[PDB]
Design a binder for these strands. Sequence first.
DNA 1: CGAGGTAGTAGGTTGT
DNA 2: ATACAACCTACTACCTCT
Length: 746
Amino acid sequence: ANNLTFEAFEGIGQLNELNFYKYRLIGKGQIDNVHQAIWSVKYKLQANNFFKPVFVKGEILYSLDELKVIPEFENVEVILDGNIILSISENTDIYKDVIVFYINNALKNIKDITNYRKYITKNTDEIICKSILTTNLKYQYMKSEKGFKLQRKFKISPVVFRNGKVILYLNCSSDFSTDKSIYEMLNDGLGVVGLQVKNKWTNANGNIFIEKVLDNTISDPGTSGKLGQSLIDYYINGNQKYRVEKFTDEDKNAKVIQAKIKNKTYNYIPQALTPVITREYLSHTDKKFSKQIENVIKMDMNYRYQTLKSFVEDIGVIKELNNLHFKNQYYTNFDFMGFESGVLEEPVLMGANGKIKDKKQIFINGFFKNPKENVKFGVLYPEGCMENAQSIARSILDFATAGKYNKQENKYISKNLMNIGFKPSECIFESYKLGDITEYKATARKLKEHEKVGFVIAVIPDMLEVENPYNPFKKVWAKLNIPSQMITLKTTEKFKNIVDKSGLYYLHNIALNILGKIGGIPWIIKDMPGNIDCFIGLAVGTREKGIHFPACSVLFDKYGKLINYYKPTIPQSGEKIAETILQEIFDNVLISYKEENGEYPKNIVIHRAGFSRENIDWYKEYFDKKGIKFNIIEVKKNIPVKIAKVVGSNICNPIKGSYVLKNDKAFIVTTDIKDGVASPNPLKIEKTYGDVEMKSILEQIYSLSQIHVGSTKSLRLPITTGYADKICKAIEYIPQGVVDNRLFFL
DNA sequence: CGAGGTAGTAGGTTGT
DNA sequence: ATACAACCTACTACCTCT
Ligand SMILES: [Mg+2]
C-alpha cells in the first residue's frame, strides 16, 4: 500500500540521565509579567557567566555547569536549592532544549574553505548556514555585488521520548540579508531617503521606513531621544557599550539618520541600520540576482532531503551526549506512531449533461445551473486605449457562444453556455479619463443610470501615478447590487494577435469567474459522504493593528449546489470571534437556509481558519436549543511542516490528495506540484469537537478544495475557508448587508 | 485587475 | 539584544497554464 512520512531523522544513541545545578525563582516585589521576568532572568544570568546554558521548566531554572556569578534583580531573587540529576522519563521538555544546545555546539566549530566559520549559531532553534547547497551539492556561497547574502536557515525540533530514544524533526528555508550598513551607503552616495530598514543592534522592529537624513552628526548632544543624551553616548551608557566602544573619529562625525516608524519618528545611527531585503527591493536593485536565486529558493522534496541530510551529517557525533548521532535517512513510515498514510481518491465532479473527465472540459458538459436569460453587460474603457476593449468584448462574447476563439470553433468549446446580454445600444460602453479618484467614483455612478445593466466589464490600465480604479469601481458597484469583472489592459493587448492558443486558459478563468459572479454554478459532486446538510466556514482578516474583520461562507447542500457568503456588520479587534458576531452570522445564515429549504438543518460542519478558540459552550448551547448536531473543524494553513512521499529509497513530492491521519489530527496536501522544482505546502486539520469521523471530514475538505468555481485550478484552501479568505482580502469591495447568491469576490 | 500556487519580508493575536 | 510557542494577517517576486 501507499505511504509517506515527515522530514525527520532517527536518533541512534539512547540518552543518558545527567546532573544539573538547579535554581529556584522566588519573586520579591511586583513583576509586570511573570514570563518576561523569568526569561530576562535567564538571559541576563547566563550572560554574566561566560554565556553558559540555562534551561527553564515552569518557574525552575536548570543548568549543567555552575553559575558562580549571580546578579541581583530587585524584582526577583534567585535561590540556590542544591544539585540534582533529572530523570529523562518526566523531563522530556528540558532534555529537548539540552539537545538543541548540543547541536549548536557540534555545529559551531565547523569551518569551510573560507577561513571563517560556516554556520551562524546563536544557540536557538534557528541555525543559519552561510552557504546554500546547490542542486548538484556544490556548496557555493551566493552573494550579489551589493550585499544580498542568501543563506539556508535550519529550524531544529528534536523530540525526546519517555524512554531514552530521540527523534530529530527538521525544517529549512531561505533567508536574505545584507552586510552593508546604511553608513556604507552614505559613503558610497546611494540615496537612502525611503528604503525600509532593519535595526541590527536592537532587533527592535521592522517597518522602519526612513523619513529624512539629518544634518547633525551623531556626536552632537541630545541627538538620542532620551533627554540630554547624545546618540553615541546612548549606547555607551547602556549595557551594550560594545556597539560603539571603539569608534572612528569619522564615525563620531558621521551624520545621524531619522526615520519615521509606524507614524512615529525616531533617531537612529547609520552604522546600526541595514536595509530590509525583500524580493521587491532585490528585483529593483539587482534584477539578475533574483532570477538566479529563483530556482534555489523553491525546493523540491528530494532537494530538501539532500540539504537536510548534509546538515545532519555535519552534526555528526555528539561526544557530550552518550555518543548520540542521527540516522542518514528518513523513516519510511510513521506507522510506529498512530499515523496512517494514505491517498485520497479524486472526487467526481458533475457537469450539466453528466460526469466530466476533466475540469477543462466542463464546458462540453455544461454548467450545472444557469440564470435567467440575457442578463446584459457593458464595458468601461479608459480614454486612451478603447480599441483593445472592443477586441476583448467580442472575444468574451464569442466564447459564451459557439465561436470561442478568433475563428468560430466548437471543436473545444460548447455553444450557448450561459445566458448573457449582447452589449446593444442600451447600456453602452463609453470612455473615461484617469487621474481623479472622485471622477472614477463618478463614472461608476453614471453606470447606475442605465437600466438593468447586469454584470459589468471594465478595462484597467497597467500600473504609478495612475491610481488604478479597481478599488473605487469595485466599491461603487458594491454599494449597488452590481457585479464587476475588471480586466487587465495587457491581457487585452494579448487578444488582438491570433498567434497563440494560450488565450483559452485566460478565457476559462474569466468565464468561470463571470459565471461565478452571477448565480450560475459550473459543477457539483456526484458522490459525497452525505451525512451533512450544510457546510459553513469562516475566517478573520485584519488590515490594520487592532482591527479584525470576520467573514463567513456557506454551502446549503453537501454537493455544493449553491454557494452563499455573509460579510459581518462590524469589526472585532481580536482574533477570537465575538459572541455577538457569532449570533449575527448564524442568525442570518440559518434564517436564509430556513427560507430556501423550509427549516433549519439536521446537522452541520464548520471550518475555522485559525484556532477555533471560540467559546465552545456557546456553540453547544445555541445548537442544543435549536436541536442541531454540529462538528467543529479547524483548517490551519500557515504551518512550517512539510511532507514527503517515500518509495523505496526515493523521496518525491506527495501527489494531490496525500493524507496522514492520527486520531482527530491530520495533514493533507491539497495541491498538485510537479516533482521538478517545488514542494507542496500541506495544511493541518484538527477536530476539537465533532461527531463525523475523521476520514469523512478529510474527504469532504479535499473535495471542497477541488470544487473551486473561480478557476479550473483547484484552490489549495477548501472553498469554505478559501472564500472567507477572499472576502477578508477585499472586505470593503464586498456587499456586507446579507447573504447573496451571486459571488462578488472571485 | 485570467487563475492558481510556491517562496521571501514584515507584523500581529492567543494560551501555556 | 532577548518571552515563548503556535497560528494568523499583509505585500511582492516568480512561474505555469487540455
Ligand atoms: Mg474576480
